[PDB]
Amino acid sequence: AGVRCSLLRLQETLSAADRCGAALAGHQLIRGLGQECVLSSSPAVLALQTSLVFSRDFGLLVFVRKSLNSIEFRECREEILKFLCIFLEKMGQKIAPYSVEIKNTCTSVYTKDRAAKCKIPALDLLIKLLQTFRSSRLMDEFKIGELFSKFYGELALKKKIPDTVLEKVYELLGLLGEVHPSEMINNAENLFRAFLGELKTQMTSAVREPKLPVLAGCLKGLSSLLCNFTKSMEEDPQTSREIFNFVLKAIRPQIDLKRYAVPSAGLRLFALHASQFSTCLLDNYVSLFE
Amino acid sequence: AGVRCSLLRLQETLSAADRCGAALAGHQLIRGLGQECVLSSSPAVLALQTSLVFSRDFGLLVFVRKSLNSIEFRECREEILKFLCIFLEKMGQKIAPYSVEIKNTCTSVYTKDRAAKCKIPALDLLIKLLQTFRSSRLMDEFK
Amino acid sequence: NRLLNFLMKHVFHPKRAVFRHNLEIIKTLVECWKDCLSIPYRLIFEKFSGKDPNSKDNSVGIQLLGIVMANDLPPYDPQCGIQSSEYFQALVNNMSFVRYKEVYAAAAEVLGLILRYVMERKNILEESLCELVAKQLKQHQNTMEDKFIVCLNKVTKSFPPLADRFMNAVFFLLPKFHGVLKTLCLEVVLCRVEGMTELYFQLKSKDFVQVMRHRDDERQKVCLDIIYKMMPKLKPVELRELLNPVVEFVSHPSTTCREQMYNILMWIHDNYRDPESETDNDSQEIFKLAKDVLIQGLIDENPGLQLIIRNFWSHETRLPSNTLDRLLALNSLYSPKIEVHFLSLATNFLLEMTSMSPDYPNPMFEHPLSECEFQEYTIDVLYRSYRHGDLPDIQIKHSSLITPLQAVAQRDP
What we know:
Shape of chain A: elongated
Oligomer: part of a larger assembly
PDB class: dna binding protein
Subcellular location (chain A): Nucleus; Nucleus, Nucleolus; Cytoplasm, Cytosol
Family (chain A): Belongs to the PI3/PI4-kinase family.
Protein name (chain A): DNA-dependent protein kinase catalytic subunit
Structural class of chain A: mainly alpha
Organism (chain A): Homo sapiens
């Protein structure tokens, strides 16, 4: 029983913090928490970790959702969410039942400026939920209304947020535009209202530099929305070619860094729904194959 | 019983802090503690305050002597010690028995530089002990 | 109006007492001459505006329009403006104080009252108002260190149909502690709204029990008013334990909160449908535990709160009219914790049917053997159960005999 009980005790013991004023007294215990949780790599220990960590009376996520005077808890999120993000798909076969509790767990307050260290994963955890749980009942059911209210308010805020969360807002709005059921067929049209001018604004109109994250977020948001409203009826030469040229414009690397999501949106939509825009091929040549 | 019970409740209720990361989340509760303790000005309420505050299971001084991860607790000392310094001789007839516990209560860690806000009263409380208890058995005995 | 104008330019006085005199004298001025004055808004545009590092650039004159609402004066009789909205947002920008003395804002308690102002009398400005006001209110929480709870707390009880967007995100963010701020957020939750259905999973967490009694008197009443306002739909499995400390708020000091307790209990007994004795339902436990406090609540030292239960038990709710069934019901009303007062309470409940009798105009014999008399005396707490009749004071209505019986019975065992 050594293998199971070792991790069980190493998790049960380190179930309380002592966050106070001292030398790095707000990061080290959480670092140990993460570095001891990572050792879970077998199905048995993975099941035990999913039972313990995703409990409601104890675990990392419970006090993450309960620590709200969280100025020095931003480092705790910085560690735990950035660990669980990789954890949810590195080994995620066991954890079906608690993605709803994970959605309850994510949360947001920060200074408006250049950075705060949890602005990367704050919605990237929900992006991993999008990737992990796809068409399943874990989605299309659980309060997508709260998201399309609050984050639509975030988009109407009109760039009063830094880069890292603005990318995620555009991306997650675009992907939530793909979860069709039960809501917002009428509000889907507003996405173009921005995505028509702002994508031109970001990349080649040098008013603001074509830095990668804003471009990647704007493209990913603009891309995922045409998963529905199929263009076999109308708008193939209107909103499936003059944004498609924008997709080509964005896929090419505006700098040689060429990060993951900057071209990923276009190629992903190409692999998924190239079948929708079809009248364009009547004149469009495929000589760009090389 | 309104006069006594009012101060008794206003002290018993505010017996726990919530020191965390927020806008002035390390000073305001202690400021309220001090500004509600100052209202004690009669011999009965002075006796009640000396019984409650100078207890060992609860009170300001107990957690002052127990808060040692005390970077943001320096403001708590800044308030409580600077209040009790004036408190010990503004009205100090009642408090004979616990000057030894006060001597146990004072304590010291700080950055070496130009200032830290508890470097004024840290030994000035013991100076007030010198002034208050003079030739008495409270001194010449205790360590 | 032009006499008012100079004060409207200069209400400010560094002495606060003369400032109160100024406010009171303008209040009397508008209280006597309300039908001879008008309100030019250009005189008041700058009475709320300004831009300083903390406060009071061109404005300390806030009670100016506070008097308007307090004494029944309609606004916007003179025409509006497209940029009357800055009158809102500039004062909202006054949030950045570092004031040390529990005021938290020169941003007006009164400013949010536009939703109250312009609902009964319809002007369309509020609809464009609210959206942008809320946008900037959610944004500037990260501008500088100060709290926006007051920006809902003082505008509470204003336009309830849209007063709930804040909680929709705040509940994940600022569940409250810290005393006075805790009471402010209690008053914030006091707004009645449908926006929450599944939130009782929050109270499925325990410690809303000792916090109930954190600070004395009126501060904590919203906590019980929570259950009060969500009573209709519940299946109170957890109000079992939640009412257990309420068993001890008889032991915990309060009077207004105890009155709210008694109202809660009075609704409970009637509304789990006590006569609906379903054979299988779990309400049997709460039956007896609710009776456990419903009986003893009469022991409470507030005489008015004793009477509020004395009249309550005397309705057809449990106590019948038939004399021997009445004896048995009160006989059934005994509890081990009321033995000290049971005799007085039993006789009190018994003699009320004598207290209502149409035979009072029939004194015992009424035969006029003597002539007349009357008198009254008072020298200082007193007592009141005397009255004079047609005969000398020898013969009075029967109430004069029964009432002192229970009067003394409440005192001497």
